[PDB]
Amino acid sequence: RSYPCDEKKQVIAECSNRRLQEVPQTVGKYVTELDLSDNFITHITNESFQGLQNLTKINLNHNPNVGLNITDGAFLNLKNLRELLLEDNQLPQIPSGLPESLTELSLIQNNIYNITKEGISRLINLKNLYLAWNCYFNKVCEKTNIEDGVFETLTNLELLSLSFNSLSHVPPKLPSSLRKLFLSNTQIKYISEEDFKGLINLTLLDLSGNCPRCFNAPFPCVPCDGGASINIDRFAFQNLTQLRYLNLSSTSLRKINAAWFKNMPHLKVLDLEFNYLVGEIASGAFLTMLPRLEILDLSFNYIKGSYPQHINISRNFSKLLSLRALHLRGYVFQELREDDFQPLMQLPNLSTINLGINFIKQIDFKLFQNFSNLEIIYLSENRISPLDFEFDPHSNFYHFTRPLIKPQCAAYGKALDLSLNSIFFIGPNQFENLPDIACLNLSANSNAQVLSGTEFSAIPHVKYLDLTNNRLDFDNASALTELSDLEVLDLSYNSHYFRIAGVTHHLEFIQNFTNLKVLNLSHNNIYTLTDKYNLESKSLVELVFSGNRLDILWNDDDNRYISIFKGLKNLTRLDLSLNRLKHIPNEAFLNLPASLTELHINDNMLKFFNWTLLQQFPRLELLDLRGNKLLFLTDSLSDFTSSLRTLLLSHNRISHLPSGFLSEVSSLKHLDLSSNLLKTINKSALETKTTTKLSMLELHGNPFECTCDIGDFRRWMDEHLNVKIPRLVDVICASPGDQRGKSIVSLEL
């Protein structure tokens, strides 16, 4: 049973974020990858990894987590060391004496302003070399020095990244092995014919935002003089015949020279965000040169203090015959008409159109019907209404790279996202002349309307509907009923009316749904309903009811809601978290559907739990009671369930295990008793006729009496290595003084 790391065989040591002060000397000799990131290690030497001949990969990022002193040659003994991560270590230099066998090296986020032959030039086997984010913004730092030719002997080098450093010029003498070159925010005004002359394997070039566009910069920003654009020689991309990805975001471009692409038949992604291209978008000569381009991003090229009626799309857009996705965030314009998008209407594989954050007031939705293959129409964040460093160095810096539309919703077919607009009611013609929509986001439109069953009738086949974060008035039992095919309904965060006792709250419409699988009513502050107190569906499988008031619905002096979920006959998953529950009436619990496999009652205030009621739940596999105020467990749990597979009990107040407990239920694989009040686990808790089938048991955060008693448990652990127990460095002694703070595992008996 490994300590202090958790070790797995596929053979890896997860030893991260564990409060270590030096490399542990108890690390298995079999290990090949070792992750010590986010620890407190302050020194590395030849002694540090002396045990571990077979080390292939070492991760030392973010040490000490709140300088890392590395010796000359400290790693030289490691002969299979292929990969080395030293990010966020405040290194003043590239450590000396690094082993010849390295293929990956990351020195991101340090204080290295000098890139030397001494340090690098003998590392011939390097595939990827990461040096970014060492001098940037108003960080107090020197300009970056790059010894002439230092990269010349890296003849296997495929990736080199020097971004967010002050370079001023493309370093010379780059090896032609290069696949990817990252030079973003490197302060490089001018690119010349020589700079990339013999790099005929390059697939990725990144030159954003040298000559950045600084208006409204979310970071310290310094433009080229004037507001000049980056200056790229006419012949700078001549021999770049393999380029797939070109990033020119925030280089203040106004013209785009078509001839840059003369020899670029494979260009697939072209990123031009945060430039000044409104002219070029209206007039795009360069579009001719890109009939194989899949992704084009012209986001944020708005002219500040200009908000024209219409977007102006060149006819030459019609040449982009391979375009799957077009991104136009932040063009900023008032009105979208059908004629405005003519030039895109014939693009055979144009699948995604993204118009977020354009402050668009009026759209002509029939526009979208005259398109071949549109799967995702993204219009979030407009003005449609009724008719310890700030930035992640491993992410894109000019856009978010989450999916535009949740996968679970887009899987269903064509999607239209109108979220974060001001559609405060859906008129009779809001959705007229739309394509046949299967997935529809209307979240956060502050919609207050009474839905009656005709509002979604120009688009009857929506299968997934996001209605979250509105203020809907549920005063009609035929609401949403036109959507026969509906499978998923999100009504979370619509509490506005639900809070008000005296208005009507009608939830009857749930039942008129043949195929409805998942319903989310979370955070609606439900405490009263009108007429029909019960939820009912023959199909529903999942109901989330967290963030409501079951404490009030099931108050002792009220009987009306005692069967509120019983009519959910098919139900397997039910979430009752965050309902301020101090106790559930035995009858209301017994009225929970017998079909359940998954029950969550976490983050309430439960003081007792009638375990004996688990007799009526024969399919029940997971029971989650984390974050309540529980004091004890039944001493005969197998009398009550035969199905329970996971039991979650973190953050309760259990101080004692019943005799026999955890040899009680054969079916239990995962038992979680973290952050409770156990001082020991008596010999009696361990006696057993049945061999256990328990594979994971969590005990961290309990106040263990570390003295002679716990020996019997230590043996049990030793005599049950199949039972995994994570966070051993956090299964800690509270007593006594001597053992205070140490893992219960590190004491002699």
Ligand X SMILES: *[C@@H]1O[C@H](CO)[C@@H](O[C@@H]2O[C@H](CO)[C@@H](O[C@@H]3O[C@H](CO)[C@@H](O)[C@H](O)[C@@H]3O)[C@H](O)[C@H]2NC(C)=O)[C@H](O)[C@H]1NC(C)=O
Ligand Y SMILES: O=c1ccn([C@@H]2O[C@H](CO)[C@H]3O[P@@](O)(=S)O[C@H]32)c(=O)[nH]1
Ligand Z SMILES: *[C@@H]1O[C@H](CO)[C@@H](O[C@@H]2O[C@H](CO)[C@@H](O[C@@H]3O[C@H](CO[C@H]4O[C@H](CO)[C@@H](O)[C@H](O)[C@@H]4O)[C@@H](O)[C@H](O[C@H]4O[C@H](CO)[C@@H](O)[C@H](O)[C@@H]4O)[C@@H]3O)[C@H](O)[C@H]2NC(C)=O)[C@H](O)[C@H]1NC(C)=O
Ligand U SMILES: *[C@@H]1O[C@H](CO)[C@@H](O[C@@H]2O[C@H](CO)[C@@H](O)[C@H](O)[C@H]2NC(C)=O)[C@H](O)[C@H]1NC(C)=O
Ligand V SMILES: Nc1nc(=O)c2ncn([C@@H]3O[C@H](CO[P@](=O)(S)O[C@H]4[C@@H](O)[C@H](n5ccc(=O)[nH]c5=O)O[C@@H]4COP(=O)(O)S)[C@@H](OP(=O)(O)S)[C@H]3O)c2[nH]1
Ligand W SMILES: O=c1ccn([C@@H]2O[C@H](CO)[C@@H](O)[C@H]2O)c(=O)[nH]1
- Contacted by 408, from ligand U, a second copy, ligand W, none: CB < 5 to 8 Å by type: ligand U
Asked whether position 651 contacts ligand V by CB under 6 A, the answer is no
Copy the structure tokens of residue 465.
């509907």
Asked whether position 380 contacts ligand U by CB under 6 A, the answer is yes
Q: Which of 294, 297, 473, 672 binds ligand W (CB under 6 A)?
A: 473
Which residues in the 420-449 window bind ligand V by CB under 6 A? none
Closer to ligand W at the Cβ: 269 or 450?
450
- Contacted by 250, from a second copy, ligand Y, ligand W, none: CB < 5 to 8 Å by type: ligand Y
Q: List Cα–Cα distances, 2 to 30, 56, 455, in angstroms.
A: 12, 19, 61
Q: How far apart are CA 329 and CA 299, in angstroms?
A: 4
> Which region, judged by CB under 6 A, interacts with ligand Y, from 49-57, 366-374, 496-504, 543-551?
496-504
Least gap, CB of 531 to a second copy (angstroms): 8
Closer to ligand Z at the Cβ: 306 or 395?
395
Asked whether position 297 contacts ligand V by CB under 6 A, the answer is yes
Q: What is the DSSP string of 713-735?
A: HHHHHHT-TTSB---GGGSBEEE
Nearest to 436 by CA among 377, 386, 379: 377
Least gap, CB of 212 to ligand Y (angstroms): 7
Least gap, CB of 410 to ligand U (angstroms): 7
- Contacted by 163, from ligand Y, ligand U, ligand V, none: CB < 5 to 8 Å by type: none
Binding mask 429-468 for a second copy (x = CB under 8 A): -----------------x-x--------------------
| Chain residue at closest Cβ approach to ligand U | 520
Copy the structure tokens of residue 454.
């005709």
Closer to ligand Z at the Cβ: 128 or 659?
128
> Which region, judged by CB under 8 A, interacts with a second copy, from 186-194, 279-287, 428-436, 526-534?
526-534
How many Cβ atoms sit within 10 Å of the Cβ of residue 130?
Answer: 22
Which residues in the 99-128 window bind ligand W by CB under 6 A? none
Asked whether position 274 contacts ligand Z by CB under 6 A, the answer is no
Query: Are 330 and 300 spatial neighbours (Cβ–Cβ below 8 Å)?
Result: yes
Which residues in the 391-420 window bind ligand Z by CB under 6 A? 392, 394-398
Asked whether position 603 contacts ligand Z by CB under 6 A, the answer is no
| 3-state helix/strand/coil string of 109-171 | CCCCCEECHHHHCCCCCCCEEECCCCCCCCCCCCCCEECCCCCCCCCCCCEEECCCCCCCCCC
Q: How far apart are CA 355 and CA 336, in angstroms?
A: 10
How many Cβ atoms sit within 10 Å of the Cβ of residue 280?
Answer: 20
Q: Which of 66, 501, 721, 749 binds ligand Y (CB under 6 A)?
A: 501
Q: List Cα–Cα distances, 47 to 44, 63, 73, 97, 644, in angstroms.
A: 8, 18, 11, 15, 49
Q: How far apart are CA 102 and CA 118, in angstroms?
A: 15
Element (H, E) at 589: helix 586-590
Closer to a second copy at the Cβ: 6 or 38?
38
* Pairing status of strand 6-8 against strand 12-14: antiparallel
Q: Which of 488, 489, 599, 657 binds ligand U (CB under 6 A)?
A: 488
Which residues in the 425-444 window bind ligand U by CB under 6 A? 441, 443-444
Tell me which amino acid residue 719 is. E
Q: Which of 200, 387, 500, 631 binds ligand Y (CB under 6 A)?
A: 500
Query: Are 725 and 698 spatial neighbours (Cβ–Cβ below 8 Å)?
Result: yes
Nearest to 389 by CA among 185, 133, 653: 133
Asked whether position 402 contacts a second copy by CB under 8 A, the answer is no
- Contacted by 180, from ligand Z, ligand U, a second copy, none: CB < 5 to 8 Å by type: ligand Z
Q: How far apart are CA 691 and CA 704, in angstroms?
A: 26
Query: Are 42 and 19 spatial neighbours (Cβ–Cβ below 8 Å)?
Result: no
Q: Which of 30, 307, 389, 391 binds ligand W (CB under 6 A)?
A: 307
* Pairing status of strand 536-537 against strand 567-568: parallel
Binding mask 357-396 for ligand Y (x = CB under 6 A): x---------------------------------------
Which residues in the 518-557 window bind ligand U by CB under 6 A? 518, 520, 522, 542, 544
Which residues in the 151-180 window bind ligand Z by CB under 6 A? 180
- Residue 79: Cβ-neighbour burial (10 angstroms; 0-12, 13-18, 19+): exposed
Assign 358 to helix, strand or coil: coil
Largest CA distance in the chain: 84
| R_g over Cα of the chain | 31
Q: How far apart are CA 18 and CA 38, in angstroms?
A: 8
How many Cβ atoms sit within 10 Å of the Cβ of residue 255?
Answer: 12
How many Cβ atoms sit within 10 Å of the Cβ of residue 216?
Answer: 10
Least gap, CB of 413 to ligand V (angstroms): 17
Asked whether position 136 contacts ligand Z by CB under 6 A, the answer is no
Query: Are 551 and 524 spatial neighbours (Cβ–Cβ below 8 Å)?
Result: no
> Which region, judged by CB under 8 A, interacts with a second copy, from 52-60, 499-507, 611-619, 651-659?
499-507
Asked whether position 269 contacts ligand X by CB under 6 A, the answer is yes
Asked whether position 10 contacts ligand Z by CB under 6 A, the answer is no
Asked whether position 504 contacts ligand W by CB under 6 A, the answer is yes
- Contacted by 92, from a second copy, ligand U, ligand Z, none: CB < 5 to 8 Å by type: none
> Which region, judged by CB under 8 A, interacts with a second copy, from 136-144, 596-604, 666-674, 682-690?
136-144
* Pairing status of strand 159-161 against strand 180-182: parallel
Q: How far apart are CA 452 and CA 472, in angstroms?
A: 12
What is the DSSP-derived secondary structure letter of residue 316?
G
Closer to ligand V at the Cβ: 268 or 714?
268
Q: List Cα–Cα distances, 603 to 514, 548, 651, in angstroms.
A: 33, 12, 9
Which residues in the 346-365 window bind ligand W by CB under 6 A? 359
Asked whether position 306 contacts ligand Z by CB under 6 A, the answer is no
- Contacted by 689, from ligand U, ligand W, a second copy, none: CB < 5 to 8 Å by type: none
Copy the structure tokens of residue 394.
């491993």
Asked whether position 400 contacts ligand V by CB under 6 A, the answer is yes
List, in order, residues 6 or more apart from 202 with CB less than 8 Å away. 178, 179, 180, 181, 196, 240, 242, 243
Binding mask 242-261 for ligand Z (x = CB under 6 A): ---x-x--------------
Which residues in the 304-323 window bind ligand X by CB under 6 A? none
Binding mask 158-197 for ligand X (x = CB under 6 A): ----------------------x---x-------------
- Helix, strand, coil percent values for the chain (each to nearest 5): 10, 15, 75
> Which region, judged by CB under 6 A, interacts with ligand Z, from 200-208, 477-485, 563-571, 710-718?
200-208
Q: Which of 38, 88, 206, 455 binds ligand X (CB under 6 A)?
A: 206
* Interface positions with ligand X (CB under 6 A): 180, 184, 204, 206, 208, 245, 247, 269, 271, 394-398
* Interface positions with ligand U (CB under 6 A): 380, 402, 405-406, 408-409, 419-420, 441, 443-444, 466, 468, 488, 490, 492, 518, 520, 522, 542, 544
* Interface positions with ligand Y (CB under 6 A): 217-218, 250, 274, 329, 357, 397-400, 500-502
* Interface positions with ligand V (CB under 6 A): 245, 268-269, 294-295, 297, 299, 327, 329, 354, 396, 399-401, 403-404
* Interface positions with ligand W (CB under 6 A): 302, 304-305, 307, 332, 359, 450, 473, 475, 503-504
